[PDB]
Amino acid sequence: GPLLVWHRGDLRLHDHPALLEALARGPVVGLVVLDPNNLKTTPRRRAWFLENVRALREAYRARGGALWVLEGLPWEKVPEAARRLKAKAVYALTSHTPYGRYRDGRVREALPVPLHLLPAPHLLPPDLPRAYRVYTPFSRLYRGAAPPLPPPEALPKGPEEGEIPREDPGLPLPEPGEEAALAGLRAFLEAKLPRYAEERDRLDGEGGSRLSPYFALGVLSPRLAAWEAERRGGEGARKWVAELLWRDFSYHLLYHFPWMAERPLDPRFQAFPWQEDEALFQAWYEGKTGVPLVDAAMRELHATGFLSNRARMNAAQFAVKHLLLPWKRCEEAFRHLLLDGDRAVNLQGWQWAGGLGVDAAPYFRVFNPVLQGERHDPEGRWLKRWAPEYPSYAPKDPVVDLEEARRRYLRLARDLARG
Numbered sequence: 001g002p003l004l005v006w007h008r009g010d011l012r013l014h015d016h017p018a019l020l021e022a023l024a025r026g027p028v029v030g031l032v033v034l035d036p037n038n039l040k041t042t043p044r045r046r047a048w049f050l051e052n053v054r055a056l057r058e059a060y061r062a063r064g065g066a067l068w069v070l071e072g073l074p075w076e077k078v079p080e081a082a083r084r085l086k087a088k089a090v091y092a093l094t095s096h097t098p099y100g101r102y103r104d105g106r107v108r109e110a111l112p113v114p115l116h117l118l119p120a121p122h123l124l125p126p127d128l129p130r131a132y133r134v135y136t137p138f139s140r141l142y143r144g145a146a147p148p149l150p151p152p153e154a155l156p157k158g159p160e161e162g163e164i165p166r167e168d169p170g171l172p173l174p175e176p177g178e179e180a181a182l183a184g185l186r187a188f189l190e191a192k193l194p195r196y197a198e199e200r201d202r203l204d205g206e207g208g209s210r211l212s213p214y215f216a217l218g219v220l221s222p223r224l225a226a227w228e229a230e231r232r233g234g235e236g237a238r239k240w241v242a243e244l245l246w247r248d249f250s251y252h253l254l255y256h257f258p259w260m261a262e263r264p265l266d267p268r269f270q271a272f273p274w275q276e277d278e279a280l281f282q283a284w285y286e287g288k289t290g291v292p293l294v295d296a297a298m299r300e301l302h303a304t305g306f307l308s309n310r311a312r313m314n315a316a317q318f319a320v321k322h323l324l325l326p327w328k329r330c331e332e333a334f335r336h337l338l339l340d341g342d343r344a345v346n347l348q349g350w351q352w353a354g355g356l357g358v359d360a361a362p363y364f365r366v367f368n369p370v371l372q373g374e375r376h377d378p379e380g381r382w383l384k385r386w387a388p389e390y391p392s393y394a395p396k397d398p399v400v401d402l403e404e405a406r407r408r409y410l411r412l413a414r415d416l417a418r419g
């Protein structure tokens with residue numbers, strides 16, 4: 001009887017605790033399930049997920065092993081592959097999210113053999129006893145990466161079942177699979193790391209690793225990335241890893257503060273008067289707001305599935321602070337455009353940028369949008385690639401008056417906030 005290895009958002013061989021835990025007991029057969037709960041989403045993200053599954057099978061086939069791919073509900077398909085293979089047990093990485101817990105609960109009932117879950121590799125775990133809303137106190141618990149675990153060398157032979165359907169992403173995708181992801185990481189650590197801390201805030205995002213699409217499906221392990229930056233060492237190295245830590249902190253917050261997915265973390269913002277308004281939602285959404293910097297950001301995201309940290313925090317704050325659009329609508333639509341879109345992380349971003357209480361980011365911080373453009377794109381190159389309509393970051397029949405609206409937010413917000 002083979003042990004099944006059930007890969008969810010961990011489409012990799014390297015640093016894979018459930019894969020090893022099973023491999024030491026006996027022969028294995030991996031399984032993915034294409035779950036409608038994750039895959040009724042935009043074409044770009046269905047394809048990104050599916051092509052990474054496809055690369056994961058190529059990775060098994062290449063080491064001589066077997067990856068089933070089945071389609072439908074996990075509590076209906078994990079048991080089916082259990083019966084059809086006669087597995088003695090199934091292995092997977094714990095998920096501390098509300099769907100994770102629900103699916104994993106349901107699978108464990110329908111399975112007649114054990115379901116053994118193992119800690120996913122993290123820099124810091126999301127389910128620690130104490131609850132922090134501030135990053136600094138949280139980041140202090142971190143002492144440096146533990147060593148990552150090897151990949152298998154060669155996998156045992158097993159029968160293979162399932163089709164990986166092919167979907168139109170609608171746009172150009174990165175190279176799928178952990179062979180592409182580990183090449184990308186080593187180029188990055190080798191060519192850009194020294195300057196990361198000087199370069200992280202450009203609008204073109206070209207001083208960073210561009211590896212988020214991979215970290216989102218677990219195609220690259222955050223403990224391998226950190227451990228490796230820690231070996232290279234130097235200055236870039238500390239700051240890059242501090243960013244990986246902002247990803248773990250995003251899961252930390254959503255775990256301890258679940259209601260955060262419904263409402264601002266800061267109680268003082270729970271009654272803020274958003275003004276739904278279709279006309280305006282559409283112009284933010286489609287980058288037609290008249291603000292060079294927001295329409296570049298919104299238009300790159302549409303065409304590419306990717307956006308830099310500094311464009312995102314601008315594009316996202318603008319909706320909340322200058323347009324006063326309701327966060328849930330926006331932040332949903334945002335995450336659907338992103339290959340790397342990740343519920344907790346995108347929520348943490350919206351709550352930070354939007355001044356609703358991640359890390360005590362103060363309401364008063366309002367991006368001046370032309371300023372933001374002059375400090376983070378020094379001779380225009382970015383703005384000309386994504387909206388050459390605009391001759392500079394000077395706004396051009398903006399859908400609101402910026403100061404009227406800066407002055408507006410600061411006003412509504414100072415009552416609420418400290419009144």
Ligand SMILES: Cc1cc2nc3c(=O)[nH]c(=O)nc-3n(C[C@H](O)[C@H](O)[C@H](O)COP(=O)(O)OP(=O)(O)OC[C@H]3O[C@@H](n4cnc5c(N)ncnc54)[C@H](O)[C@@H]3O)c2cc1C
Pocket residue numbers: 200205208209210211212213215216240243244245246247248250307308309310312313316335338340341342343345346347348349350353
């Ligand atoms: C409005 C908002 C929404 C966002 N939504 C998401 C999302 O859905 N999925 C997502 O991956 N990132 C999201 N981010 C966080 C961050 O912007 C991106 O992960 C970063 O742009 C990825 O580019 P990079 O791979 O070059 O990062 P790098 O600069 O190379 O950073 C290394 C890695 O650390 C992690 N990281 C970096 N910055 C952050 C951050 N601010 N918070 C959490 N993790 C971070 C990422 O996994 C990143 O790939 C969002 C940020 C904001 C402001």
Ligand SMILES: Cc1cc2nc3c(=O)[nH]c(=O)nc-3n(C[C@H](O)[C@H](O)[C@H](O)CO)c2cc1I
Pocket residue numbers: 007008009010032033034035036038039041045046049094095100216217340341342
């Ligand atoms: C765009 C996208 C699509 C995904 N599709 C998944 C799927 O079809 N099956 C699955 O097991 N995991 C899927 N994952 C990861 C799930 O979110 C998973 O339940 C999480 O890893 C909990 O383990 C998934 C993630 C993302 I972004």
Ligand SMILES: [Cl-]
Pocket residue numbers: 115116117
């Ligand atoms: Cl157990």
Ligand SMILES: [Cl-]
Pocket residue numbers: 146147148149
């Ligand atoms: Cl280890």
